[PDB]
Design a protein around this ligand. Structure first.
Ligand SMILES: [Mg+2]
Ligand SMILES: [Zn+2]
Lengths: 112, 91, 251, 50, 77, 63
RNA sequence: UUCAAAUGAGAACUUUGAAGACUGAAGUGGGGAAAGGUUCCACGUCAACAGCAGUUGGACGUGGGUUAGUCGAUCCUAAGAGAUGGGGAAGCUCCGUUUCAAAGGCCUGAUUUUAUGCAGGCCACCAUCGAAAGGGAAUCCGGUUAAGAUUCCGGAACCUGGAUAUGGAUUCUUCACGGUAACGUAACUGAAUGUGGAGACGUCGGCGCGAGCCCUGGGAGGAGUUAUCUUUUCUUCUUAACAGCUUAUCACCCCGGAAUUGGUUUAUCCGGAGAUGGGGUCUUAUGGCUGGAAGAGGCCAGCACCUUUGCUGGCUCCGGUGCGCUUGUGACGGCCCGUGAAAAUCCACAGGAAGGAAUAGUUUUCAUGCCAGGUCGUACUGAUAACCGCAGCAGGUCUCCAAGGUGAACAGCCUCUAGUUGAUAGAAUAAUGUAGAUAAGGGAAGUCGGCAAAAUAGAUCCGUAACUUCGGGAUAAGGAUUGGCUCUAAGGGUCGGGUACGAUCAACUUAGAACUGGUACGGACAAGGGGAAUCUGACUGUCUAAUUAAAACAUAGCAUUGCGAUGGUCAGAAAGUGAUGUUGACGCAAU
RNA sequence: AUGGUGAACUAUGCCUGAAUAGGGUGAAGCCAGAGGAAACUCUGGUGGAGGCUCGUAGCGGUUCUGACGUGCAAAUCGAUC
């Protein structure tokens, strides 16, 4: 039934003043201050959290290696697997449709 | 069973604000919280986020709309008026 | 006496606008060169709520015609506009809702919103929810267009003024009674501090023209002249008639 | 307060140096009239207003 | 603050030219209720980390005591 | 001693109650236990094969 | 409050011991913010102050005491403040913060007379100040002082910046491979430019999980009671930051193709845009194991001593339960004419500039190895005595942690930890007072007036009118029961079958029945008096701080009036000036 | 009358934080059942809405026209609310 105190001069229950009670090897209960939780990175278009990427605080993405921050595929660490598939599909169909419109319209003008 | 006879969604107001004023609100609250039909994915999943903003939970599509119904009647007659004026410009 | 509440609003000390969460300046696209002779296609990214107004706003994205850049626009969403749409902005752009077209290049009877009244203002009349403009008649030579305003006014503006075809989203926002004092509290928590309103007749004579007296009353006519000065203009400004509206507009 | 600016703590050090009675030998001076310290200040009687 | 399992790496790490001290600690542990054994921990002080190699076999543990280089300052406690 | 005594049913009469029936034990808590037991029972029957998906479905809606 | 001892000239008041008490965890406890400034601690000491006293003190005299890369500030921006270029103003000064400015600076080259002239390209934002509760790089445990510690000591870490070599990785297919895939790894060239993400966000409701505490069983120790009983009551059995491995609801991938529709939540949503099912991938909150680390801390036993003092031994283990309390977190739902900040900073992606390989090259997003981390703050109180109230003032002053019982209850009452036992005392018990109470018979006759007081009161069952905007009124009104003890019944989890039941374990929940007593039992505490009407305000809300809380004001709803921007309304001495206005009649302004 | 100083009290706006037991009632949505000349009506669950309600902390300040009224206090104290 031991009671704890803040270990810093901020007395108020603000967002960056979170504490949790642990038991130290001294047999006593201290409130140890905890950092804010990290939000996952999101896809550019869909906005869903994209898997394979570590969830860290923004400054902590500088001391982490490259394999934790991106996936192999094109637009890897930024876009979804299916969104990358979507623009792969979309790009092909209408770069092939343009060269269909290109040959179709030149036929109409050539007839006249 | 049938918990209320006529107050419906406006039971939350209890005995306040007058009977007629409670049933103006009931009509618009019924529409603004109703689920509407997705014109892109074909599902009954369109919900109001905020006045004029109707997001379909499936297919994640947002359409601009009226305050309390997805498509106001005055807007729909506009969409047909533009159409008939359009189909004659390139007639 | 003392200066009165409508006099104290011009100091703009506490009577300013609340603008922390307001999205931006919802203007039209600029009339640089690519609309006056052709068009340019744009995409709608997201339609979002705006604190302070009841009409949603759209984020319309265009490609920069002079740099490898993706300049984004803040338009007032037309009812019907959806995320993922394609938006065409030019002179030869089609007559479809969501497109930005000049008044002189649209047929008579067209429904247009977010309409400049001087070409290049990037936005003007018919901005509020459920409001639109209609073209009445063009004057080709000395180019002009005759249109009707949401107030019911007929206004002639330059034929090259622009406007998004259709009607602003969010129509009928006012058909719902707030039913509650505190509902008006949140309507004006994000608009401005013009709520609540003590009556001027429930006041002291030092504080208002209408204050004082053994009974709560005006005392003199509440219909006030144009030539009245700041301090005397409290009541029904410049009223031509008053009473109850019997008859039509008679405009 | 605990957290304080250097101005405040510097000016408190000035007021802590000055807080003690008259030196004893000064009243033994020729033609001396100062009988005690008339600017002595205590934390419970009057505040510094700094 | 790190663990290493292979004895091969410990002998390489103990001649890392930044190692100055190392400790040998004796712990009386209990594997089964039938008989206790002696668990000894070999620690080496690196410039940034403390590698603790835990050895449970008493015979193999003894072979590692004289396997350390003579230039190493070994602490036994 | 009192805790042990309460285990045989003593000191639980009408004169020993100050909170309502709901306050002492919430009704929604009672239903949650009821509905979860029936669902762990129906689900175990499908796994054992003692029931087909059609009978399992009607009782779920009955339960 | 009391008894005794010590000190002293002197003790109701100081110290120590003992006894009796209180605060009772939204404390009379432990920390802070604002404020104070040395009040903190030691020694000496009582002329003055502590409205009695005084040997004591927040007093007096003399001194000691605040140790940081990691905690803050320092940086960003918010509402705002504010230079400049200018424009007014006789003028002190006012406007205005990107405005009618030639407004600025980074990478790479070229010469190694060499400073950076000179090759170039890129850039158009734009002073600065403004939060010790916003945003934000990184430290934990144990020990230590008279007084300081996430700052000292010991140990063990991490971050930023900067030099830097080795190992590793890769190439003659010049700048990696594996998996159908979601994706993985120790790395695994990528300049300008552009795009994306994190930073980055409401509140309430219930539900799942974690942490600490609470409760509890066995065992190893210590203490208490023991006329009697009690395998008994109290108490110790702990594991940090950081690191490795593993651990996940959600989400996603492959197969396959669904009505006799199925799956499924406490809460009803999802599936031919691919359901159920089978198999996998991922976030690492969180949990487990291991390193740290038992060497620390805790609890005991034995042996010496003026002693600076010690030494040596053990044990520090294994579980259970939950609508419990507090707190964190997840997936959802409700709500809005409310939809609930900004920037610094950090990362990723697209793009292909350039540089590169064979007797040899390249990567410092892999590991290890080297050096530095400035300045100011840091003691103490934080309040019936350190702040503000003329004071050591029954007032005021923002916040964190929160044990057991009764009980719905961070109610009221009792107790544990911790802290107090402070408020001038002594003797008697007149009147009159303040506060607390009880009264025969009557029951408002008192009084302006039931003012004051009394009565009712918890819970369970029964029953409930007029009227009504159909939501209420309503706990209407009005009845019964309530303890203790001995029982009875029902309400769960997990394991057991050739491809009905049995065993084990564990919650208080309800209902019923006998018996029992001076008819008692929400036994203290806690806790609505009710009804019939008239006037008035619709309601919730707000105000005369310190004589008026209302029929006043507000309010929704209703209605009117002005204005399309060369405008309405208003501000300004003036201005290349302003508010609404980041606005646009479903608006703004005035009634 | 001239020139200055104050929003450390208080008023209102804006910015950024923070706080708020335990009960009663039981709105939409959802499930099942019953009566049924159909039409439709009824019942029991579920759920947890409201500028709802009893009532703590908090914020306030109705009555005793109580205490006090050369006070503890230049506005406090107790009960009731
Ligand atoms: Mg029939
Ligand atoms: Zn859809």
């Amino acid at each position: 039934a031991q009671r704890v105190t803040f270990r810093r001069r901020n007395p108020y229950n603000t967002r960056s003043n979170k504490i949790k009670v642990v038991k130290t090897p001294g047999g006593i209960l201290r409130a140890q201050h905890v950092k804010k939780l990290a939000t996952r990175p999101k896809c550019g278009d869909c906005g869903s959290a994209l898997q394979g990427i570590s969830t860290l605080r923004p400054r902590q993405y500088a001391t982490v290696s490259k394999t934790h921050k991106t996936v192999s595929r094109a637009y890897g660490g930024s876009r979804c697997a299916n969104c990358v598939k979507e623009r792969i599909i979309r790009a092909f169909l209408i770069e092939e449709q343009k060269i269909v419109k290109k040959v179709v319209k030149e036929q109409t003008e050539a007839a006249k | 069973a049938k918990r209320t006879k006529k107050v419906g969604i406006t039971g939350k107001y209890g005995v306040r604000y007058g009977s007629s004023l409670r049933r103006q609100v009931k009509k618009l609250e019924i529409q603004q919280h109703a689920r509407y039909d997705c014109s892109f994915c074909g599902k009954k999943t369109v919900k109001r986020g905020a006045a004029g903003i109707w997001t379909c939970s499936c297919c994640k599509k947002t359409v601009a709309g009226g305050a309390y119904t997805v498509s106001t009647a005055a807007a729909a007659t506009v969409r047909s008026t533009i159409r008939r004026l359009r189909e004659m410009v390139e007639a | 006496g003392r200066v009165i509440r409508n006099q104290r609003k011009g100091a703009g000390s506490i009577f300013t606008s609340h603008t922390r969460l307001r999205q931006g300046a919802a203007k039209l696209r600029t009339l640089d060169y690519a609309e006056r002779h052709g068009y340019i296609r744009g995409i709608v990214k997201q339609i979002v709520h705006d604190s302070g107004r009841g009409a949603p706003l759209a984020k319309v994205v265009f490609r920069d015609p002079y740099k490898y850049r993706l300049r984004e626009e803040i338009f007032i969403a037309n009812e019907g506009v959806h995320t993922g749409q394609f938006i065409y902005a030019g002179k030869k752009a089609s007559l479809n809702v969501g497109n930005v077209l000049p008044l002189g290049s649209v047929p008579e009877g067209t429904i247009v919103s977010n309409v400049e009244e001087k070409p290049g203002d990037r936005g003007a009349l018919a901005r509020a929810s459920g409001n639109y403009v209609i073209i009445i008649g063009h004057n080709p030579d000395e180019n002009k267009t005759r249109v009707r305003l949401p107030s019911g006014a007929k206004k002639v503006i330059s034929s090259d003024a622009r406007g998004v075809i259709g009607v602003i989203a969010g129509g009928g926002r006012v058909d719902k009674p707030l039913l509650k004092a505190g509902r008006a509290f949140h309507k004006y928590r994000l608009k401005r501090n013009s709520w609540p309103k003590t009556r001027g007749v429930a006041m002291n004579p030092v504080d208002h023209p209408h204050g004082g007296g053994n009974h709560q009353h005006i005392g003199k006519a509440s219909t006030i002249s144009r030539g009245a000065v700041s301090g005397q203009k409290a009541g029904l400004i410049a009223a031509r008639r008053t009473g109850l509206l019997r008859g039509s507009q008679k405009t | 307060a605990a957290q304080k600016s250097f101005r405040i703590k510097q000016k408190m050090a000035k007021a802590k140096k000055q807080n003690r009675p008259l030196p004893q030998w000064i009243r033994l001076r020729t033609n001396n009239t100062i009988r005690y310290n008339a600017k002595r200040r205590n934390w419970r009687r009057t505040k510094m207003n700094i | 603050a790190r663990e290493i399992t292979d004895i091969k790496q410990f002998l390489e790490l103990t001649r890392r030219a930044d190692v100055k001290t190392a400790t040998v600690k004796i712990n009386k542990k209990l594997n089964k209720a039938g008989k206790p054994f002696r668990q000894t921990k070999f620690k080496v002080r690196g410039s940034s980390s403390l590698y603790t190699l835990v050895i449970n076999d008493a015979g193999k543990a003894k072979k590692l005591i004289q396997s350390l280089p003579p230039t190493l300052k070994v602490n036994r406690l | 001693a009192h805790a042990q005594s309460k285990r045989e049913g003593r000191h639980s009469g009408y004169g020993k109650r100050k909170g309502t029936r709901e306050a002492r034990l919430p009704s929604q808590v009672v239903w949650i236990r009821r509905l979860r037991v029936l669902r762990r029972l129906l689900a175990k029957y499908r796994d054992a094969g003692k029931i087909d998906k059609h009978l399992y479905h009607v009782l779920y809606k009955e339960s």
